[PDB]
Amino acid sequence: STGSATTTPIDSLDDAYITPVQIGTPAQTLNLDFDTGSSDLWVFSSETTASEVDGQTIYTPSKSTTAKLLSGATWSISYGDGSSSSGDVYTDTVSVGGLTVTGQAVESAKKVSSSFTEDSTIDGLLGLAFSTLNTVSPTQQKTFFDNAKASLDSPVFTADLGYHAPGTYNFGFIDTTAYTGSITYTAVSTKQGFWEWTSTGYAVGSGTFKSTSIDGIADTGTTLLYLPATVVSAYWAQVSGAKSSSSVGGYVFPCSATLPSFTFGVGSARIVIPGDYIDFGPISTGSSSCFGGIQSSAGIGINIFGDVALKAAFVVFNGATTPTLGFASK
């Protein structure tokens, strides 16, 4: 089997992407944030504290003839930005782009943090990291991909995120029309539960490539590119007036700037992030100070190849017995 679904930016900055997901019988379609940096599929629901729902579409398990309470199971998750959610668990039929999993754990939120409430466009998360990170207790549950894998034509999914435009998540096949040149595959460590790999270096604009190993994660659920302070300083030094602002929480730059590109290495291959992908717009409405899309990972404790990086590539998440990651230009 295969599946193919369009993923759409939630706003004009590509702050996140949402993908429609069918849950239950009859189908209830929710728009979920596909997140290769976590492993829980959770949704706003009829169980979510009423004051914490503000415009989201909810899953109502009592209206699904295939929903079953997973007795005694609870979940609770916190993300790197301090947001959180928790609740109980159902199993139900879940379909993405025509690919169907029966008995998928659907984690129903009883509580969500304010940031979720305040974002009406995201109805929940669909985790695509390794199932070892799943938070369900006392019996850990599998991700949608883990459950689908054996049925897929090939045990892979691909992320093809758009810049200020829709893109595609495919399951079970590689669309050879969706990228240019060849796909370069690179090793993955699953030791921390992530799609963790080592970039071979970087360049800023038309500058020379610096060969250096950068261990980090491929994370569709993180907006920005978080890299070591040395690398980030080298990038922003090429933008007149750019500075790190403790009050804003990262590098800012004059909105009048033209940003240089940023290249990252995948083995001997190179992925080029155009400068415009690194512009996250005014820090507050009407400001002429703009927020940068490349930020320091210092104090996160991990480098993150988030959407800024991934949207410059066609990315293969290869879930073979020994997982690997592939990157192609597009």
Curated annotation (Swiss-Prot):
<keyword id="KW-0645">Protease</keyword>
<feature type="active site">
    <location>
        <position position="199"/>
    </location>
</feature>
<keyword id="KW-0064">Aspartyl protease</keyword>
<feature type="domain" description="Peptidase A1">
    <location>
        <begin position="17"/>
        <end position="328"/>
    </location>
</feature>
<comment type="similarity">
    <text>Belongs to the peptidase A1 family.</text>
</comment>
<keyword id="KW-0865">Zymogen</keyword>
<dbReference type="GO" id="GO:0006508">
    <property type="term" value="P:proteolysis"/>
</dbReference>
<protein>
    <recommendedName>
        <fullName>Endothiapepsin</fullName>
        <ecNumber>3.4.23.22</ecNumber>
    </recommendedName>
</protein>
<keyword id="KW-0378">Hydrolase</keyword>
<keyword id="KW-1015">Disulfide bond</keyword>
<dbReference type="GO" id="GO:0004190">
    <property type="term" value="F:aspartic-type endopeptidase activity"/>
</dbReference>
<feature type="disulfide bond">
    <location>
        <begin position="255"/>
        <end position="290"/>
    </location>
</feature>
<keyword id="KW-0732">Signal</keyword>
<feature type="active site">
    <location>
        <position position="35"/>
    </location>
</feature>
